[model samples]
Target: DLGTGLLEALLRGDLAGAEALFRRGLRFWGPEGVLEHLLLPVLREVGEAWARGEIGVAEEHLASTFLRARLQELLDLAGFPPGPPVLVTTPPGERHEIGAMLAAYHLRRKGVPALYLGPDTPLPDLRALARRLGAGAVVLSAVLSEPLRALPDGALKDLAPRVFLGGQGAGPEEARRLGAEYMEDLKGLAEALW
Candidate 1:
């Protein structure tokens, strides 16, 4: 299947082949389907492999960069028709943004256009932006526990009416403490926001 070949091409750093395979998948499954069934799962597996040392940093970076660019293209092509606004970003010191990018993609898919502020975004800036945009929600991601610890009390609460915390670093208790909802994954987010 194209999914298998696409994964293999990504692992081999074959950008052209991966892009072709991705286009084939889009034709067959459409954007949302391809994201839910193929790209997201592949990204997870690639992350796991990287963590276990099965792949080097360069390989991980290669895959992540390629995927990010492709996802951005999809987002641009699938632009929402002006629904509720959502702000997506990582807390300060949290450099892992792939999850946040995926969250933004899903938000857009759900008819909510997200403004993505990349990694290490300051809390004050996020709050200001959310307030300025009158965002319906502010979605924050942290891939490591340390960044979650860096958040001050009530920081996320004042950002928007709804605050969503997610990624590997955030726990249910942290969400509770921050007066935010915890989204376990993209599926949960889609269900909640859509």
Candidate 2:
């Protein structure tokens, strides 16, 4: 299994071994298939192993960085259907970006043109870009509340007609304050909007 070999390579610090497994997995499962079925799922196990102190932080960081790189490469190769693109990003000071990146990937897989701007997205630039691009929506994700609180009232409210807040720190109260809707996770995001 890709997960088995991947986990082993990650724990043992075998970069080429992990890459070999990723190459094989991509061949068999393609991008999204491997990501949803293997890489993302294996991440839970790795995270838990670190939580239990079975794996060191170094190991965890290695695995996470490996997966994140692969995901970004996949996104770089991803094609988009023609339409108003969805903009996915994080507010300033919000450094956790894997979730936001996944949002862009998921939207891309669903045939939406997704523009992914990485972490620490300046709100003024975001607003200006969204307006210029005629974006259908803007998806903002955060893992902590402090960074979100750093946003001013109108920073995102008028960026697009539909504003979506996601990740663990996202809440309905904060969404209302920012003139947006809150999505708990990818599943919720799928059901609510593409």
Candidate 3:
């Protein structure tokens, strides 16, 4: 009932149909709405199906790229919000910003201001932006184990704002060690804002 035609097409390797359907779907659903109703479900199905050899890695990659483009489209639609702006970014070498992009878009939809600083943002630039923007919270999207070791020790000492770090690579211990709150996903982001 979610009308995930575009995602389904992408999974089936029908790139043309997927693109067309995605655009059509976008007409009815805002970026966040499409994700809530279509993209995530399709991704879950793809993951489950891939484990069974039902879909090849190429098809999976195709779906991921398609989803990334759609997500970028959503991010474009997400403008500035009125609440305290939260800066979201990843450490150096972390190329994956889709999760952070989705989180920012959804946060904007929920009326909590968020800035997507993109990936590989230098620590100095991050600090300067946080200071200039007077951000309420600094959110890190970490998906690697080793880079996190440097988070608290290098950049965060004596920082003023609260920090919330979360992603696939983070855990309770890392969060505790970093002395920043840990959230599981965008829903956690929304919860913290409230």
Candidate 4:
């Protein structure tokens, strides 16, 4: 019932109301609120609406930007603990990073040191950053097949850490080829990392 209202607010591009409901829903639903109230249902609704052409790409981008900002703000308040840092970024030529940013923010919230390398990070720079940070894990995001292919085992081997490949484009074959762990989505990430 409450989820429906929240979904409507999101679908209608009511950033303020959607954010309010999302925060309130988080409080009401406790820890599971992220998955129960926000991720599973709300994201599903937004995806479905966009697929049906009920919402334009701009609307979707706006909603995602607002949500990403909210998540990062929350993470800023929740300090990360002292630990090996985790580097998260998209492969070269992949510019969409709201999803990666949100994931990094959540990792920070969970007291894990997280560094967001942003989108389209060159492989050499990414490797250097990982080495400099002494990263414990490297999460590579390939939102498309081309980028996934571009990230060969050579790059993965360059980073001396556990590599976790994720995003919509990374399937079993690519994951295996890269010798990295494959995550299905945000939920899969939460479960695997937690």
Candidate 5:
């Protein structure tokens, strides 16, 4: 299957092979389907391997770089469609960009205007950007508790009518405390917007 072959290629650091698999998968399953079923599961496995010390930082970094590049290519090809504007980013101290990227991709795929601001964005800067862009929603991604807690209370409330928090850091209570709605994943984010 493409999933297993893709995983092998990633593990072996065969960027060309991985890219080929990705293209093949996209042709078969489409972007979102491939992302949710194949790419995401592979990414999760890579993270787990890193956590278990089965893979070194260099390997993990290589895999991430390759995957991120592919994702960017897909996003560029897909382009943005007209819909509600949303600002997607991560709080300060959070360096995980994949979640925010995926969120933006999903939003864009749904014809929502998603502006991804990368990672480690301060609340003030995020608010400024959202206001400047006339965004209808501000989606914050945080992979760790510290960064999630670092966000100022009500920081995004006045910035947009709908405030959303997601990633590994956010929970129902944290979302409530931050005056934001919680979205568990890309699907949830898409559902919320659509």
Candidate 6:
């Protein structure tokens, strides 16, 4: 199975093998399936395994590094027309960037011009970037709540024309409290942006 083999290849830190498996997955399931069904799921499991001391930190880092590189390539290929730019990033101190990367990828695939700032971007810098780019929307992703919570009230106010929070750390209630939109998942992005 592609899932099992992809998982194995990631755990073994076999970039070439993983690349081969990724090609097979892309051919069979397309980019969305390969990312949502295969790579992301395995990466989540890998993070969980590391949390429980099942895998080495180096291995986890390797998997993340490899996945990130591949995702960038895919993102580069998934072009977008110049209109209503969107910015994707994680809050300061939040390190898991894969979620935000996927958001950029899917949004670009949907014809939304997206700029991914990756992880640990301070909110003010994000706002500056958004303003400079005239971003129609900004998406902030995080898997930990502390960074999301650490922001005092109104931190997100006027951050952009629209502010969206995604990932586990960005709760719906939290979004409501901050006057931002809650993105439960990557679906419905272009609809929300437009």
Best by lDDT: 6
* Runs off by more than 4 Å, candidate 1: 1-4, 185-194
Per residue, candidate 6 scores C-alpha lDDT tens digits across 1-194 of 78778778877768789889888888887888888777878788887889999888888888888888889988998986787688888888899998899889989998889888878898788889888988888888878989887887777777798888888888888877766788886877767876
* Superposed model 6: Cα runs more than 4 Å off: none
TM-score-sorted candidate list, best first: 6, 5, 1, 2, 4, 3
The residue-by-residue lDDT of candidate 3 on 1-194, one tens digit each, is 43457657766678788877767766687665678777777876877778999878888788778887778777766767775688888766676666677777767777777888887787778878888888887777777777777665535432336777778877878878767777887777877867
Please give the range of 10 consecutive residues that has the lowest summed lDDT in model 3: 151-160
| Clashes (N, CA, C under 3 Å) per candidate | 0, 0, 0, 0, 0, 0
Superposed model 3: Cα runs more than 4 Å off? 1-15, 23-33, 41-62, 82-84, 150-160
Look at candidate 3 and tell me the lDDT of residue 61: 81
For each candidate in the order shown, give its overall lDDT on alpha carbons: 0.82, 0.83, 0.74, 0.72, 0.81, 0.84
Pairs clashing within candidate 3: none
Candidate 6 structure, TM-score to reference: 0.94
Q: List the residue pairs that clash in candidate 4.
A: none
Output the worst ten-in-a-row residue range by lDDT, candidate 1.
75-84
Compute the lDDT for candidate 1: 0.82
Per-prediction TM-score, please? 0.85, 0.81, 0.73, 0.79, 0.89, 0.94
Comparison by TM-score, 1 against 2, better one: 1
Cα distance off (Å), candidate 5, residue 142: 2.1
- Arranged by lDDT with the best first, the candidates are 6, 2, 1, 5, 3, 4
**The 10-residue segment with the lowest total lDDT in model 6:** 149-158
The alpha-carbon root-mean-square deviation between model 3 and the true structure, to one decimal in Å, is 3.7
Q: Report the Cα lDDT for residue 32, model 5.
A: 80
Candidate 5 Cα errors over 4 Å, as ranges: 82-84
The 10 consecutive residues of candidate 5 with the worst lDDT sum are 150-159
Q: Give the least accurate 10-residue stretch of model 4, judged by summed lDDT.
A: 31-40
